[PDB]
């Protein structure tokens, strides 16, 4: 396979390692990290998530990269691209998502990771568009989407189809950025 690593000024976006699973599990168990998600995850659930990531990298050659901070930390979380195949109005497409350990918030690291992942999406993969979705309360998350230059149509708000019809977290907002908008920043 030989999954290609992506480099920013500060960040290394790399394939996941066994050593990552411990660090990622405490992130998944952190109520500040998982605040706008349905719940925190146990070790088994966190490992399942990593298995899905590795399987995504095996099939597609890209995925949510593990974020390394050379000269500081081996693992501060993930940022990158996931294929959207679920039954939503904007499928099929590619989504960008991110999760940082709280110690690394407020540093522009999610921004830098996301810019590196989108550079890849538009320059190497040459995708027409990348989406991002989150819940309205998760201001840190859609705050990053709009600072990245992604734009929301409130009319494109949707109920996540892999949650229950009456799930309290069901309502998601959609941000989009196309090759043209990304190149124009
Ligand atoms: C969503 C999340 C990744 C955002 O991370 P973040 O660190 O807030 O985002 P950025 O990398 O853009 O950093 C922005 C902050 O750094 C500051 N900053 C400092 N130096 C900066 C730099 N060089 N570049 C950019 N921002 C910089 C900005 O002013 C801003 O400060 P503020 O948040 O207090 O206003 C993070 O809150 C998180 O992991 N949350 C939990 C997981 C989650 O919900 N993910 C979304 C799933 S839908
Ligand atoms: Zn959600």
UniProtKB/Swiss-Prot annotation:
One of its GO terms (molecular function) is acyltransferase activity, transferring groups other than amino-acyl groups. Keywords: Acyltransferase, Transferase. Pfam families: Acetyltransf_3. The keyword Cell membrane does not apply. Its EC number is 2.3.1.-. Signal peptide: none annotated. Residues 11-180 form the N-acetyltransferase domain. CoA binds at residues 98-100, 106, 138, 143-145. Catalyzes the transfer of an acetyl group from acetyl coenzyme A (AcCoA) to an acceptor substrate and releases both CoA and the acetylated product. It prefers the peptide Asp-Phe methyl ester (or aspartame) and the peptide antibiotics polymyxin B and colistin. Other substrates like dopamine, serotonin, puromycin, chloramphenicol, D-glucosamine, glycine and N-alpha-acetyl-L-glutamine are used and displayed lower activity. This is Acetyltransferase PA3944. It comes from Pseudomonas aeruginosa (strain ATCC 15692 / DSM 22644 / CIP 104116 / JCM 14847 / LMG 12228 / 1C / PRS 101 / PAO1).
